[PDB]
Amino acid sequence: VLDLDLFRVDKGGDPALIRETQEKRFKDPGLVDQLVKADSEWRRCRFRADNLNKLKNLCSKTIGEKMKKDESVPENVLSFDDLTADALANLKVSQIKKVRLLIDEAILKCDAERIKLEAERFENLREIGNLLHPSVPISNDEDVDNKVERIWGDCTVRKKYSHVDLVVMVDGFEGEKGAVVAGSRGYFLKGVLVFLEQALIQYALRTLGSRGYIPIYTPFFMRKEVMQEVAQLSQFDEELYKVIDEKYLIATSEQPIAALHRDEWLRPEDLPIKYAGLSTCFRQEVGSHGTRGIFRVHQFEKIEQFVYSSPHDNKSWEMFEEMITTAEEFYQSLGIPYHIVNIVSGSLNHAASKKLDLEAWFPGSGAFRELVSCSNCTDYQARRLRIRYGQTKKMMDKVEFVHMLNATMCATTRTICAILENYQTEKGITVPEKLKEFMPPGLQELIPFVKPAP
Amino acid sequence: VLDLDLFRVDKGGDPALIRETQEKRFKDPGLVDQLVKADSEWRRCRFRADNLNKLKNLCSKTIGEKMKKKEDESVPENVLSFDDLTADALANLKVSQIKKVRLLIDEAILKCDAERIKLEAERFENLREIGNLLHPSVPISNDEDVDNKVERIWGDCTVRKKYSHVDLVVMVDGFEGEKGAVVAGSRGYFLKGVLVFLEQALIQYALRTLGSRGYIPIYTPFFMRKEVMQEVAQLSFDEELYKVIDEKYLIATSEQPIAALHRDEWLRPEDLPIKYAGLSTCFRQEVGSTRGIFRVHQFEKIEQFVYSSPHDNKSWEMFEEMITTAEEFYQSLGIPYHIVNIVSGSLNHAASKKLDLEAWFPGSGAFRELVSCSNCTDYQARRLRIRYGQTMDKVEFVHMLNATMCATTRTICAILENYQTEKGITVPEKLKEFMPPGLQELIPFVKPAPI
Ligand SMILES: [Mg+2]
Ligand SMILES: [Mg+2]
């Protein structure tokens, strides 16, 4: 969520800049005007209600000195404007009472507004997205305007089989009974594919590990209270699962890891802190209808990159590029062709300044499909989670919050499909060099077709 | 659930033995008698009704040949019986006699619709509560602590070492349980760094070991639909699992999804044994109520699931292979342990026998179970309807055995407590190959102990 001081010109903000961003994503720019308005009303109330406190006091102190010594009149010329220490000392105690009653009744009307405002403010702030990097293509149309930045390896080449067939032909896949047991799209992974996935996971962990990442195995479900801080409203509907306190099944490894450092002060010598998330992830995936394979599925393992960065100096954008670079070199090494894609503003979620997708070329399917997504969220989440930049070297008006980035480096199911269609040959699927050491004996070299293709 | 013919003496049964068993288990010996009664009442109704009918036809048959070939008294008394009314005695009784005898047979025909209800009532209710046959070796007691039999011991289970698994897990900087309780709830945890690596080593080592002994590794869904989770899982809906919303449950073992894999199938005898190494993350609510990774709500588990032939000793030989395979595993990891034969009182209804491998924790000064192996014979297979062969005469069911070979967090604790030293945790030889460089000799203590 954005700093409120950004919506206040007297605090150094530019409501105009945010109005304009709200336009670059495609969303209501008035959502800003309503926030400023409600914020201003909020702020005037705190001011006016402090005046009323003084007027009430003078009232109760004077009704104080008059009971140092029933009888009534309607008697009001007094608007609170005309009300003075002397003006009231000339009045019957019954009249000063009916005035103080008009004050405390106004002081309460403030508290009523303030309350309905504090919310109308927070409901609006939640729906206003983060500032965009200048490089983001401005469009609402994802397919036409996503912009291809780099290409690598041969993305033309066509091969014989789709990954749907190949998971059967090597007999690593039970989708019929998986569909009975867990519901639609449920699956079992058999044999070679289990050993293959373990190799991927090992190679990824080794990779990130030696680049400085700390492998971390997350809990798979989060408290509903911590979840609301790390995700958005369109998350709790589209894909998350409800569990019974009351908890949600994590859709990524970024959720628990963000909440890991919550309400804490990270020291600059310690940044950047890089984690390699290892988790099983669950997505309800509403909107994806259209039959089946292991590619789009409700349950899978991910290896995620999560980085805590300093706010200053562009160290977070430097880290951002370093993060997608790590992702590329991983797929480079496994010999998967891909192209990097800069996602349009309309398709970014609220916390993202910029998003890069690495999309692999699937030779069998003859399509690009997304293996990786990479985001810089700057301080948007950090400020909700209160993760503060912990500098000891000077004195500060307001604290600064760390930058947070997350990339999903490897989603085992999708990556496996990618490997399968790219390494597929005749006898079977060739095992990628970088994975051989991680396969069991007899499974290095090739993975044979044991069964015919549908 | 038991084969109904086991209750029927003339079907080869021994209802005494089943009673005796139910005694040995300490469950209710009565539930047998009830069902022998309801079963017999129905069958008696039925044999009467069927056999009383077989005579009514032989009444009409030889009554047919009578007027056709050639040739008025009361009913002769020496024919009314099942055994005394036979083809011959009908001839000497003429006809218009046979006619009247046939009216007495029809007066005695009854409907069993009333008795059937009662039988099915007993089956649906009681059958599920009569436990499986016991292996001769199962010690008979209801008190585990005193009467569990220790069959074997390996390595030195006396030895003490300085720190428990609770401290080592901190000292290696492998655990954030403070901040994992914030995120996931009570007992929630993060595993980090060296311990994420140790565990991937274990999973790799376990799967090589099972894979090269002929097991097919299988990665199951981590949740199943409420409907199917009911149709499969053992009486122990004891543990409260977890609920997901779709109406789904979070699995507590791989055993449930896999069992559900072969449900309602006929299995080629040629193919058996079918051996699976199940690999899944498991979720246990009720962790039992000072926080380690030993008792937690979520952990990875590698399980052995075997389908076997019902004939001869095959499943009991299989049972021994399985418990052995595990011992050898913990042996190669250099983990001291003893095998425990679990008493009759404590067995699940489906278990014929259960062996527990309990490793020794030097730091803690305690035995804690890393492995449990059970042979359920055809008990569950019969309910799941997983059939042996013949894809007519009496149907047979496969035997099913299952053992959890490695529960990663528990195993990891055993390794730490046993391999601890002054400098760090020595890496166990068979694991070295699977760890990253810098981790192959030793896992260092980078933090002071929580003292
Ligand atoms: Mg996607
Ligand atoms: Mg446990």
From Swiss-Prot, chain A:
<feature type="modified residue" description="Phosphoserine">
    <location>
        <position position="234"/>
    </location>
</feature>
<feature type="modified residue" description="N6-acetyllysine">
    <location>
        <position position="302"/>
    </location>
</feature>
<dbReference type="InterPro" id="IPR010978">
    <property type="entry name" value="tRNA-bd_arm"/>
</dbReference>
<keyword id="KW-0887">Epilepsy</keyword>
<dbReference type="InterPro" id="IPR002317">
    <property type="entry name" value="Ser-tRNA-ligase_type_1"/>
</dbReference>
<protein>
    <recommendedName>
        <fullName>Serine--tRNA ligase, cytoplasmic</fullName>
        <ecNumber>6.1.1.11</ecNumber>
    </recommendedName>
</protein>
<feature type="binding site">
    <location>
        <begin position="283"/>
        <end position="285"/>
    </location>
    <ligand>
        <name>ATP</name>
    </ligand>
</feature>
<dbReference type="GO" id="GO:0019899">
    <property type="term" value="F:enzyme binding"/>
</dbReference>
<feature type="region of interest" description="Interaction with tRNA">
    <location>
        <begin position="8"/>
        <end position="60"/>
    </location>
</feature>
<keyword id="KW-0805">Transcription regulation</keyword>
<feature type="binding site">
    <location>
        <position position="304"/>
    </location>
    <ligand>
        <name>L-serine</name>
    </ligand>
</feature>
<keyword id="KW-0991">Intellectual disability</keyword>
<keyword id="KW-0547">Nucleotide-binding</keyword>
<dbReference type="GO" id="GO:0001514">
    <property type="term" value="P:selenocysteine incorporation"/>
</dbReference>
<feature type="binding site">
    <location>
        <begin position="370"/>
        <end position="373"/>
    </location>
    <ligand>
        <name>ATP</name>
    </ligand>
</feature>
<dbReference type="Pfam" id="PF00587">
    <property type="entry name" value="tRNA-synt_2b"/>
</dbReference>
<dbReference type="GO" id="GO:0060090">
    <property type="term" value="F:molecular adaptor activity"/>
</dbReference>
<dbReference type="Pfam" id="PF02403">
    <property type="entry name" value="Seryl_tRNA_N"/>
</dbReference>
<dbReference type="GO" id="GO:0006434">
    <property type="term" value="P:seryl-tRNA aminoacylation"/>
</dbReference>
<feature type="binding site">
    <location>
        <begin position="297"/>
        <end position="300"/>
    </location>
    <ligand>
        <name>ATP</name>
    </ligand>
</feature>
<dbReference type="GO" id="GO:0005829">
    <property type="term" value="C:cytosol"/>
</dbReference>
<dbReference type="GO" id="GO:0042803">
    <property type="term" value="F:protein homodimerization activity"/>
</dbReference>
<keyword id="KW-0597">Phosphoprotein</keyword>
<feature type="binding site">
    <location>
        <position position="406"/>
    </location>
    <ligand>
        <name>L-serine</name>
    </ligand>
</feature>
<dbReference type="InterPro" id="IPR006195">
    <property type="entry name" value="aa-tRNA-synth_II"/>
</dbReference>
<feature type="binding site">
    <location>
        <position position="252"/>
    </location>
    <ligand>
        <name>L-serine</name>
    </ligand>
</feature>
<dbReference type="InterPro" id="IPR042103">
    <property type="entry name" value="SerRS_1_N_sf"/>
</dbReference>
<dbReference type="GO" id="GO:0070062">
    <property type="term" value="C:extracellular exosome"/>
</dbReference>
<dbReference type="GO" id="GO:0006412">
    <property type="term" value="P:translation"/>
</dbReference>
<keyword id="KW-0225">Disease variant</keyword>
<dbReference type="GO" id="GO:0098619">
    <property type="term" value="F:selenocysteine-tRNA ligase activity"/>
</dbReference>
<keyword id="KW-0067">ATP-binding</keyword>
<dbReference type="GO" id="GO:0006400">
    <property type="term" value="P:tRNA modification"/>
</dbReference>
<dbReference type="GO" id="GO:0016525">
    <property type="term" value="P:negative regulation of angiogenesis"/>
</dbReference>
<feature type="binding site">
    <location>
        <position position="283"/>
    </location>
    <ligand>
        <name>L-serine</name>
    </ligand>
</feature>
<dbReference type="GO" id="GO:0000049">
    <property type="term" value="F:tRNA binding"/>
</dbReference>
<keyword id="KW-0539">Nucleus</keyword>
<dbReference type="InterPro" id="IPR045864">
    <property type="entry name" value="aa-tRNA-synth_II/BPL/LPL"/>
</dbReference>
<dbReference type="GO" id="GO:0000122">
    <property type="term" value="P:negative regulation of transcription by RNA polymerase II"/>
</dbReference>
<keyword id="KW-0007">Acetylation</keyword>
<keyword id="KW-0238">DNA-binding</keyword>
<keyword id="KW-0436">Ligase</keyword>
